[PDB]
């Protein structure tokens, strides 16, 4: 703020950069891997309860 | 702040108020003969009326013989010469840290006045027989080959010698860079301040270098002292001495400095130049008679003080440049026998891919294991001797007559050990990165792995050890000694990974 | 900061050069006060050392 040539310019930029800004992030709405986990257990892991157990 | 030019004019107002000798007889080639200066000391500083400073070296009967710190265009016959009343001396103290100064310790960086805790002389008696101790602290360079083969100690003098363009400066540099590990800490007694003396180097080359120091945030704990190519022979000759004092401050005050003399071959070239021109009769290869004394008294100034004296160390890495690999030429011979061991770098080694091009065969540290870290010591048991036996079997291999299971065995390991010590410039490694590498090589876990692939082994290994067995890596570091169980965890840990 | 420092340093260098030129011109304009002060300074210095 004391090294810059133009008055009240560093002070204004500092205040806006320390608040909040956008970022490349997502939410847990598109749960593609969570929905597939139940189906994979129900066809591969649950098949052993009746095939491996009978053998 | 509010007319800064007015504050400088008011402080430099009243100064000249109490200033009311010899005349010059002849002047040429950095030398001035001078009639008078009757009360002058041998090795005293003198100002010429013109401004340029000089040093008295030949107090003869009729006249005094002066080497100049400057050019001489500015000195004329009859011009009045003046006594200083002081022997050449330097500012010292931690104020120098970060600064680039000339031989007399003037800022040449642009960063303004040096603040000094005091002033030492350029020539100072080395600490005696009496106030010293055994070298027992490592000065870790982070150079696999060096820290396992020729381990350097806080207090020891260690020669770096080889031809031109072999990597002498590179070894010294990579050492400095490493100290970051400890200098950004707060434990003053683990810290190592570096002094880099540029002797006969071109300026841009000192530049190119301070840049790299900064690119590595390494400048905050260094002091470069520069007597570049163009400066007066006297400044070149002097620099190492002035520098030795700058870092003597650290040693005297409980801390540890590291002085790199890059390089003495030039200091002697210049010291030759004062003498031939002062007309002192020459020694071998036109050098002066005591060109040995020159270096001996500097290098002895490195030492590791006793507890009574503050336990401060000063450690020296002089550099020396040979020609055509000849180490039997005057100066190298001199210094070779002055120091506590050497690292020989070789051009042949270089071009076939050993970099650092250290010559294990010829490199020694005479302190030895005393200055190695216990852990490194433990897994480096016998490596250096083995690597010798390896060159042995590899010389017998040239007969190209069939090998047995014993010779092929040690050939496979030596080749992989060789390869495991290769290292990129600017990448010093922590001890705990070094240790498992060495252990993997020595105990022969590397021995069934392609030679071109040992490159990838190294980083892939370290990546995994950080990821998984970080608890070991942090013990090695904290403890510096592989306890019996730690050998176990490490043993397991390595095998594990070698099966991919 | 580099531009502010360069401007301040240029101004100080320009002011010093203008002050130096004025001091040299004044001495060449036969100064009667300089000649009288040079003789009185020499006598005072020699009496304090003897
Ligand atoms: N480990 C390394 N890997 C690759 N190149 C290196 C290594 N060490 C040094 N070099 C290179 O080899 C070149 C010369 O190295 P240098 O460190 O200046 O040796 P030197 O003996 O000081 N040469 P000089 O003092 O100018 O005669 C430099 O360009 C470095 O990049
Ligand atoms: Mg070099």
């Amino acid at each position: 703020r004391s090294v810059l040539k133009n008055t009240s310019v560093i002070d204004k930029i500092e205040s806006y950069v320390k608040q909040y800004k956008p970022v490349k992030i997502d939410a847990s709405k598109q749960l593609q891997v969570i929905e597939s986990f139940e189906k994979h257990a129900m066809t591969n892991a649950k098949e052993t309860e009746s095939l491996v157990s009978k053998e | 702040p509010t007319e800064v030019s007015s504050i400088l004019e008011e402080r430099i107002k009243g100064v000249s108020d109490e200033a009311n000798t010899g005349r010059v007889l002849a002047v040429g080639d950095g030398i001035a003969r001078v009639f008078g200066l009757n009360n002058i000391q041998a090795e005293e500083l003198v100002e010429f009326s013109s401004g340029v400073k000089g040093m008295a070296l030949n107090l003869e009967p009729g006249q005094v013989g002066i080497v100049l710190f400057g050019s001489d265009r500015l000195v004329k016959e009859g011009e009045l010469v003046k006594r200083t009343g002081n022997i050449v001396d330097v500012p010292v103290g931690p104020g120098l840290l970060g600064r680039v100064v000339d031989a007399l310790g003037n800022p040449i960086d642009g960063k303004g006045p040096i603040d000094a805790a005091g002033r030492s002389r350029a020539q100072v008696k080395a600490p005696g027989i009496l106030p010293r101790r055994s070298v027992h602290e490592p000065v870790q360079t982070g150079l696999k080959a060096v820290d396992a083969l020729v381990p350097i100690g806080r207090g020891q003098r260690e020669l770096i010698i080889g031809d031109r363009q072999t990597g002498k400066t590179a070894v010294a540099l990579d050492t400095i860079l490493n100290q970051k590990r400890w200098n950004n800490g707060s434990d003053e007694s683990k810290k190592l301040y570096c002094v880099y003396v540029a002797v006969g180097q071109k300026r841009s080359t000192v530049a190119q270098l301070v840049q790299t120091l900064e690119q590595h945030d390494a400048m905050k704990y260094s002091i470069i002292v520069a007597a570049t190519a163009s400066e007066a022979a006297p400044l070149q000759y002097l620099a190492p001495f002035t520098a030795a004092s700058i870092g003597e401050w650290f040693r005297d005050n409980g801390k540890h400095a590291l002085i790199v003399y890059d390089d003495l071959s030039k200091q002697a070239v210049a010291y030759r130049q004062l003498s031939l021109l002062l007309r002192r009769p020459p020694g071998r290869e036109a050098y002066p008679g005591d060109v040995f004394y020159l270096h001996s008294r500097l290098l002895e100034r490195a030492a590791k003080l006793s507890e009574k004296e503050g336990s401060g160390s000063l450690t020296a890495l002089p550099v020396i440049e040979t020609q055509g690999g000849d180490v039997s030429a005057y100066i190298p011979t001199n210094v070779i026998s002055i120091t506590d061991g050497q690292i020989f770098l070789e051009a042949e080694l270089f071009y076939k891919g050993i970099r650092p091009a250290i010559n294990v065969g010829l490199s020694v540290s005479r302190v030895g294991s005393a200055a190695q870290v216990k852990a490194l010591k433990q897994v480096a048991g016998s490596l250096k001797l083995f690597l010798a036996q390896y060159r042995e079997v590899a010389a017998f291999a040239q007969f190209g007559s069939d090998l047995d299971a014993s010779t092929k065995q040690t050939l496979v390991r030596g080749e992989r050990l060789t390869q495991l010590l290769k290292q990129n410039q600017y990448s010093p490694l922590a001890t705990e990165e070094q240790v498992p590498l060495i252990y993997a090589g020595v105990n022969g876990h590397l021995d069934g792995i392609e030679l071109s692939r040992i490159g990838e082994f190294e980083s892939s290994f370290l990546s995994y050890l950080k990821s998984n067995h970080n608890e070991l890596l942090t013990e090695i570091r904290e403890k510096g000694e592989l306890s019996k169980e730690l050998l176990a965890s490490l043993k397991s840990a390595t095998e594990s990974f070698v099966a991919t | 900061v580099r531009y502010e420092a360069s401007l301040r340093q240029l101004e100080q260098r320009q002011l010093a050069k203008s002050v130096i030129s004025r001091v040299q011109s004044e001495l060449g304009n036969p100064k009667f006060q300089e000649k009288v002060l040079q003789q009185s300074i020499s006598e005072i210095e020699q009496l304090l050392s003897k």
Side-chain angles (χ1 to χ4, degrees), chain A residues 22 27 41 45, chain B residues 1 14 19 21-398 400 402-500, chain C residues 5 16 28 30:
Chain B
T21 34
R23 282 209 260 93
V24 164
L25 297 158
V27 63
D29 306 331
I31 288 314
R33 289 156 46 214
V34 189
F35 173 64
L37 292 145
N38 284 350
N39 279 348
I40 201 169
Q41 292 161 298
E43 288 199 61
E44 194 175 310
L45 235 41
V46 290
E47 300 168 336
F48 281 80
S49 89
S50 92
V52 56
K53 272 185 160 70
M55 194 180 173
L57 283 195
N58 278 356
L59 328 187
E60 306 164 34
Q63 43 151 330
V64 184
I66 301 174
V67 290
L68 314 171
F69 291 138
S71 176
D72 57 12
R73 44 208 279 196
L74 301 154
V75 191
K76 289 183 265 165
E77 184 203 330
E79 148 168 10
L80 158 155
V81 199
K82 206 184 168 201
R83 276 202 79 207
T84 289
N86 299 114
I87 303 303
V88 208
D89 79 319
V90 264
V92 295
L96 276 118
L97 293 166
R99 318 291 318 268
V100 196
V101 296
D102 64 8
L104 314 172
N106 308 318
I108 80 167
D109 42 14
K111 310 201 168 171
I114 309 315
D115 282 9
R119 306 187 61 92
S120 301
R121 281 200 200 142
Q123 319 282 326
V124 206
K125 272 147 195 200
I129 267 75
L130 212 34
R132 300 171 168 245
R133 180 219 248 94
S134 296
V135 164
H136 66 314
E137 299 138 316
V139 167
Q140 285 150 70
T141 80
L143 281 161
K144 277 171 285 132
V146 161
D147 284 3
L149 302 189
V150 276
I152 288 154
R154 270 176 213 247
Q156 123 179 57
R157 315 153 284 149
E158 181 72 24
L159 178 61
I160 301 166
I161 173 164
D163 270 2
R164 53 146 162 76
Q165 275 302 76
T166 41
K168 316 179 288 294
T169 300
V171 169
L173 191 61
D174 288 319
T175 312
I176 295 181
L177 292 202
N178 199 27
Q179 315 314 290
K180 263 210 134 176
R181 299 206 146 92
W182 308 281
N183 299 341
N184 295 311
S186 55
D187 187 45
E188 201 66 24
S189 73
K190 280 173 201 308
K191 285 170 147 44
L192 185 59
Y193 305 85
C194 307
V195 180
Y196 182 92
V197 193
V199 191
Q201 254 147 131
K202 66 185 183 189
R203 266 165 191 169
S204 78
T205 284
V206 187
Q208 170 54 49
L209 199 153
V210 288
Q211 179 145 313
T212 331
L213 277 186
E214 265 144 9
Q215 281 173 7
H216 286 267
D217 190 23
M219 261 289 280
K220 53 195 195 178
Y221 61 74
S222 309
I223 312 144
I224 309 318
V225 176
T228 66
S230 45
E231 297 171 27
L235 302 135
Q236 285 175 45
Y237 144 98
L238 204 73
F241 302 108
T242 51
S245 333
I246 283 164
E248 265 180 3
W249 185 89
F250 288 99
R251 177 197 62 178
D252 287 336
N253 280 290
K255 312 180 186 68
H256 313 264
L258 172 55
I259 186 148
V260 171
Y261 299 100
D262 200 337
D263 69 285
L264 301 198
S265 331
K266 286 146 152 80
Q267 192 205 8
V269 177
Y271 177 54
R272 164 170 60 193
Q273 202 196 287
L274 285 49
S275 298
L276 284 180
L277 295 166
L278 279 158
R279 295 203 81 87
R280 308 186 171 167
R284 229 219 290 152
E285 314 176 22
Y287 289 91
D290 49 329
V291 76
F292 169 89
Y293 182 47
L294 180 75
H295 282 152
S296 69
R297 61 205 162 111
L298 170 78
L299 285 151
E300 283 271 329
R301 288 170 64 179
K304 152 79 196 201
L305 306 172
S306 53
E307 245 159 20
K308 190 177 285 167
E309 299 291 345
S311 279
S313 90
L314 178 50
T315 298
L317 288 136
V319 188
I320 280 288
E321 192 165 73
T322 53
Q323 318 286 296
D326 176 52
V327 311
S328 332
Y330 195 10
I331 328 305
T333 315
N334 282 337
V335 195
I336 278 170
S337 89
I338 301 170
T339 41
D340 301 318
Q342 350 78 36
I343 292 149
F344 271 93
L345 310 174
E346 290 197 311
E348 200 216 42
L349 282 176
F350 199 90
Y351 292 109
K352 50 205 221 157
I354 300 159
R355 315 193 179 151
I358 299 174
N359 182 351
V360 179
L362 290 162
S363 305
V364 295
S365 153
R366 304 211 211 154
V367 165
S369 68
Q372 211 160 35
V373 136
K374 283 265 99 53
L376 201 30
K377 188 184 151 190
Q378 290 179 290
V379 288
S382 303
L383 175 65
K384 202 179 155 218
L385 247 205
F386 172 101
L387 270 165
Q389 310 184 347
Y390 165 66
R391 287 175 288 282
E392 155 95 4
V393 162
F396 172 72
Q398 303 321 114
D402 53 342
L403 292 177
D404 54 88
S406 179
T407 27
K408 175 182 84 179
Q409 164 68 327
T410 66
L411 208 64
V412 158
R413 195 201 290 283
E415 224 152 46
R416 272 149 201 76
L417 274 162
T418 280
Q419 191 82 67
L420 179 60
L421 294 183
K422 290 167 192 207
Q423 193 167 348
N424 302 303
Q425 206 173 346
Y426 307 121
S427 319
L429 294 180
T431 306
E432 61 277 15
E433 294 168 322
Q434 283 179 116
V435 152
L437 291 177
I438 302 284
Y439 171 90
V442 155
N443 301 249
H445 297 80
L446 276 169
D447 303 28
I449 277 124
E450 209 206 301
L451 212 62
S452 51
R453 284 181 38 95
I454 309 271
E456 94 208 67
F457 177 91
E458 200 199 289
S459 26
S460 288
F461 189 33
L462 296 171
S463 282
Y464 152 77
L465 296 147
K466 283 158 196 172
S467 251
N468 296 54
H469 313 308
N470 197 261
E471 335 231 314
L472 317 190
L473 281 195
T474 304
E475 180 129 318
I476 287 170
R477 178 176 74 256
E478 224 98 69
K479 296 239 153 167
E481 200 163 28
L482 316 181
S483 87
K484 316 175 185 183
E485 315 55 51
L486 223 185
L487 272 156
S489 349
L490 208 84
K491 175 198 157 71
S492 139
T494 328
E495 304 198 71
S496 181
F497 181 88
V498 186
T500 344

